Symmetry: D2
Subunit: 260 residues, 4 copies
C-alpha cells in the first residue's frame, strides 16, 4: 500500500513509536527511526525492520528537545531516505504533579518536546512535501489533547496545543496533496504508562495488575488497553488514498474515553 514511500518516525526506538515504524515498513515504506536507548537494542530493532519487511531502515540520533537539532534531524532524515513523504511526530514525555507543585524545568521539558518539537519538525518537513505535491504529517496527540486529567497540566497543555497546531498545518496546505491529522490514543501499556500503574500500585498498596485494572476502569470504557499495533494501523490508514480528504482532524482510538 505504501511501497516507495519514505517515512520518518520520531521517538521510535520503543513504545508506540516503534510500532508506528514497524507498521509503515510492513506497508512497504523505507523508515527512519529515532530515539534513545542502548545502541545494541536500537540496532537489533532497526535490522529487524529490514529482515522482516525488506525495506531500508535507517537510524538517526537527535534529542528533539533541541530546536536546531530537530530541524537538522529532518534534513538528515530526508537525505538518508531520498525524500520525505510521511512524518510521524511521536516522541513525548510525562510528569505527574499538581499545578502548584509542578517543576518549571518539567513544564519546560514537556512543552519543548511534546509541543515545540512538532512545530520544528513540521516546519522543516513542509518545504519538501510542498515541493513534491504530496505529504502526510501524523501527530501523536492523546485523549488528553481533547479532555484533561488532574496533575497533568504541562502534558494536557502540550497535547491540546498539538491538536491546534495540527489544524493550522492542515489549513495552510489544504488541497496541496498534503494532510495533517492527530492520532489521539487512550491508555497504551508502554513503560510510560507502567510508571503510573506502579505509582498506583504503591499509593494504594494493591496488586500490579489490579492497579492496571483501576487505571483503565477510570478512563477507558472498554476496560482494554489500546495496542501499539492498532495505532500503527491507524497511521497506515491516514497515509492511504482513502484519507486524501481527511485533514486537520483527530483520530481517537481511546476505547470510549472521549465518548463520555
Amino acid at each position: 500500500m505504501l511501497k516507495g514511500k519514505k517515512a520518518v518516525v520520531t521517538g521510535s526506538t520503543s513504545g508506540i513509536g516503534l510500532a508506528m515504524a514497524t507498521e509503515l515498513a510492513k506497508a512497504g515504506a523505507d523508515v527512519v527511526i529515532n530515539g534513545f536507548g542502548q545502541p545494541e537494542d536500537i540496532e537489533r530493532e532497526r535490522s529487524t525492520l529490514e529482515s522482516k519487511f525488506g525495506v531500508k531502515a535507517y537510524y538517526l540520533n537527535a534529542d528533539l528537545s533541541d530546536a536546531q537539532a530537530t530541524r537538522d534531524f529532518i534534513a538528515k532524515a530526508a537525505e538518508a531516505l531520498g525524500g520525505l513523504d510521511i512524518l510521524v511526530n511521536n516522541a513525548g514525555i510525562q510528569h505527574t504533579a499538581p499545578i502548584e507543585e509542578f517543576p518549571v524545568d518539567k513544564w519546560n521539558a514537556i512543552i519543548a518536546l511534546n509541543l515545540s518539537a512538532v512545530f520544528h519538525g513540521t516546519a522543516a518537513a513542509l518545504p519538501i512535501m510542498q515541493k513534491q505535491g504530496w505529504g502526510r504529517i501524523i501527530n501523536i496527540a492523546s485523549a488528553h489533547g481533547l479532555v484533561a486529567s488532574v496533575n497533568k497540566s504541562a502534558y494536557v497543555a502540550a497535547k491540546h496545543g498539538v491538536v491546534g497546531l495540527t489544524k493550522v498545518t492542515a489549513l495552510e496546505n489544504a488541497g496541496k496533496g498534503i494532510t495533517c491529522n492527530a492520532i489521539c490514543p487512550g491508555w497504551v501499556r508502554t513503560p510510560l504508562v507502567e510508571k503510573q500503574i506502579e505509582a498506583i500500585s504503591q499509593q494504594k498498596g494493591i496488586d500490579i495488575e489490579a492497579a492496571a485494572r483501576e487505571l483503565l476502569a477510570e478512563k477507558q470504557p472498554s476496560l482494554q488497553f489500546v495496542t501499539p499495533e492498532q495505532l500503527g494501523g491507524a497511521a497506515v490508514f491516514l497515509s492511504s488514498a482513502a484519507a486524501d480528504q481527511m485533514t486537520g482532524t483527530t483520530l481517537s482510538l481511546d476505547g470510549g474515553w472521549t465518548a463520555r
Copy 2:
C-alpha cells in the same frame, strides 16, 4: 480483509451508500443493499457486486422512515446474509429553508430517516452482534453533526443527534467486541448536493461549475470534493481489527471543514 463478514448498508442503491457497499464487498464481505430507484438499475448493481468481488449480495426494499419497517428490514437482512457483522446506517435526505419557514412535514421526515432510523436499525441489529461477541455499527453523520450551517435546522439537528447516539451505542457495548463510530463527511458531489449546486447557479445566475466551486470554497478548505470511494475506504478501516479500540467517536473526512 473482511472475508466471511456480513454487511448491511442503508440507502445504498446510489450515492455514498452504493460506494460503501462496493468497498465492503471488495474487501470480501457479503452485503445487503437497500434503497429506491429503477429495479433494473438496482438489479444490475446487486448483480455486479457478486460478479466483480465474488461475494453474495442481496437487495431489500424498505422505507426506513418507518420504525417498524426498519426493524423488519434488518431482521430480513440478517436472515438473507445468514448473520450481521457490520451495519452501516447511511440512508438520509435533505431540505433547505430558514427555521420560521421550515415545513413541519419536512422536519418530521428528516428526523425520521436521518435520526430515528439510525436508532431503530441499531436496536434491532445489536442483539445479533451482542450474541456473537463481535460487531461494527458505522453511522454516517456529517460535518453538520459537529457544526452548523444556515437553513438546515432539521438536518443539523438530526446529524448532531446521530453523533450523540453513536456515543451512547459505544458506551453500552464497550469491551463486548462491538464498536460504534460516526463518519462525518464534508461535501460529496452526489444528487443530494447537486440539487444545492443548482440552487446556487439559478440564484446568482452563474455557471453550474462556478456554483460548485462556490459551494466548496465557503465550507471545504481543500476546495476538493470528498469521494464516495474514500468514505467506503473509511468504513473498511473502521471494520478492521486496528479499530478494535476505536469506538464512540467521529471520523471526519471533510477537507478541513471542521478544522476552522
Copy 3:
C-alpha cells in the same frame, strides 16, 4: 435588570424551569409559565412570582409534545405578555434503558418534547423577535448534549440535536439582535434526578444520600449538584447586553463534567 422584557419558559411549573422563571421575574421581566401538575400548586407558583417580584405572571397549559399546540402556545404567550423578547425552551423528560430494550414510544416521546418542541417553539417565536430586532432564545440542553452516558440514547440524541439546532438558529439570525445559546447543566437535584438516585439506592441497596454522592462522583468532579438558581442566573446573563455577541454556543454549568 430586565424591566420591560416579556419572557416565556416551557416546563416551568417545577424544577429547573421554575427557577428559570423565578430568576427572570426577579430580574424584572413578566413571565409566562407552562407545564403539568396540580392546579393548586401551579397557581401558587404563578402567584408567588407575582407578589414576590412585582411582575405580571401568566400560566398557559399545553402539551409541548404536540407541534401545533406548542406553536399556538407561544402565540398566546406573546399575546398575554404583549410581546416576546426572551424564550426559554426548558421542558424535558427522561427514560433510562439500553438501546435494544428502549421502548419506541419512549424514544418518540423524548424526541418530540426534548427536540421537536424546541424547533416548533423557536419557529413560532422568531418572526416576533425578527420584527422587533431583539430577542433571546435560551435552550436548556445538557452535558449530554456534548457527551454521552449509558442507557440514555433518546435523551443524549435529543440533547445533541438541541445543541445543533441552537447553532443553526444563531447563524440564521446573526447580527439581527437575536441570539440563541444552549445551557448545558451537569446534575441538578430535581425530581427527574431523584428518580435516578433512588434506582441506585434500591439497586445497590445503599443509603439514599449515599446514592446521591455516588451519582455525583461518577460525572461531576465538584461533588456538588448544580442548583436551579445558578442556572437561572446563567439565563439572566445570556439575556444581558454583555452577551449580545455570544450566540450559537453552549454554556456548561456541570461542575467539571465535560472538562474530563
Copy 4:
C-alpha cells in the same frame, strides 16, 4: 456585586485587559493592573479606575514572559491587595506567517506569554485561593483555542494549550470553591487586530474600514466586533455565585464563529 473582592488582570494597561479591570472595578472589586506602556498613560488608567469606581487600584510592571517575574508579580499583587480572589490571565501577543516561514523566536515568545505565563501565574495564585477556600481563575483564550486559522500556528497552539490548562486547573481544584474557565473571544477591535486590518487594507489595497468589514465577514457571522466592555461583563459573570459550579469550560463570545 464584587465589592471587597481582590482582582488581578495581566496585560491590562490597554485593550481587553484594561476593559476587564474596568468592569471588575465597576463591580466594586479592588484591582491590580499590569503591562507595558508609557508610565504617564499607565498612571492615568490606574487613576481613573480608582476615582471613577471608588475602589483601590495598583499597577505592577512585569514582563510575564519571565516565569520567575510572573510568580513574583502575583505575590506582589496579593500583598498590595491584601489577598487575591480573582486572577485574569489576559496578556498575549500575535504574529502571522506560514509554518515553514514562522520565525522560531516568534514561536517561543508566543508560547511563553500566551501559554506558559498562564501556567506560572496560576501556580503562584492557587496556594493563596486554596487557603481562603474561594477563587476565580479566568483565562483569556480565543476562538483559536477551539478552532484554527491559517498562519497562526504558534497562537492557535498556545490558545488550545490554554483551554487544556484551564480544564486541568478546574479538575485539580474541583469542589474546593475555586473555578477556572476560559473566555474565548472572537474578533475584538484592539490594536492587536487593527494591525491585521491594516495588513488587509495594504494588501488588497482597500479602504481601512472596508478591510475591517471584510475581516469580520470571513469569521464572525454576526458581522459585529465583540466589545471589550462585553468581555468584561463575561468575567464579572464568571466571578458571580451563579457560576460556582461552572468550571473547566469555555465561554465563547464570538458572534457565531464557532457555531459553523
